[PDB]
């Protein structure tokens, strides 16, 4: 609950969920 249009401007959207995407990478399937 905040000001949505200023949230898009400063960018706690795309940038905040980019690091969630990076933290969930985990390299290597198993290396069988």
């Amino acid at each position: 609950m905040s000001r949505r249009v200023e949230r898009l401007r400063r960018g706690e959207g795309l940038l905040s969920f980019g690091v969630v995407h990076d933290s969930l990478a985990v390299l290597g399937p198993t290396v069988p």
């Binding site: 990478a25 985990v26 390299l27 290597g28 399937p29 198993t30 069988p32």
Partner: protein, 181 residues
């Protein structure tokens, strides 16, 4: 980029995209957002997705994810000429083919000054005129392919030197390979 032989693209062939149309607006917007600059305007557009390729693509990409990507036709192998793309669907060699999803800078006109430059993935007159031509950077115009890639449940793996198909396995649970640094 050599459109197969010495044939010009005909309307009985690959369909035309009308100027100031709704699909002209969609192609312009996804091509301007990727380069993040308004100086890049579209000057020709074609439809190369015959319904045979659409039905086969939808069957394979069932439950996967679909991302839009751009491929340079000049960097394409000359087996994948535009005449051949109209029936086969941009056939992939055993080494695999790379794909850029999102922002990219056009070659020769960089918009990124860092370590890398987010350049497009591949797969004395030379300075006399260049002192008044390449400083202004006169228009050189590109031929790309906006292709929908069915990347679904990718596995993150590091640099492409070991992500090539000559050594990478691609376990059957997966059908794509996300790249790290």
């Amino acid at each position: 980029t050599s459109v197969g032989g010495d044939v010009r693209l005909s309307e009985k062939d690959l369909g035309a995209v009308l100027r100031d149309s709704d699909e002209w607006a969609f192609l312009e917007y996804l091509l301007q957002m990727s380069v993040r600059t308004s100086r890049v305007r579209l000057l020709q557009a074609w439809h190369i997705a015959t319904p045979h390729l659409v039905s086969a693509f939808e069957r394979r990409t069932q439950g996967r994810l679909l991302t839009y990507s751009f491929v340079d036709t000049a960097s394409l192998d000359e087996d994948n000429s535009l005449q051949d793309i109209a029936r086969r669907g941009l056939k992939i060699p055993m080494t695999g083919m790379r794909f850029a999803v999102g922002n990219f800078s056009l070659p020769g006109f960089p918009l990124m000054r860092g370590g890398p430059a987010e350049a497009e993935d591949p797969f004395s007159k030379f300075l006399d005129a260049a002192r008044s031509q390449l400083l202004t950077g006169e228009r050189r115009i590109f031929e790309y392919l906006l292709c929908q890639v069915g990347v679904g449940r990718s596995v993150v793996v590091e640099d492409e030197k070991e992500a090539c198909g000559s050594r990478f396995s691609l376990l059957w649970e997966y059908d794509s390979a996300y790249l790290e640094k």
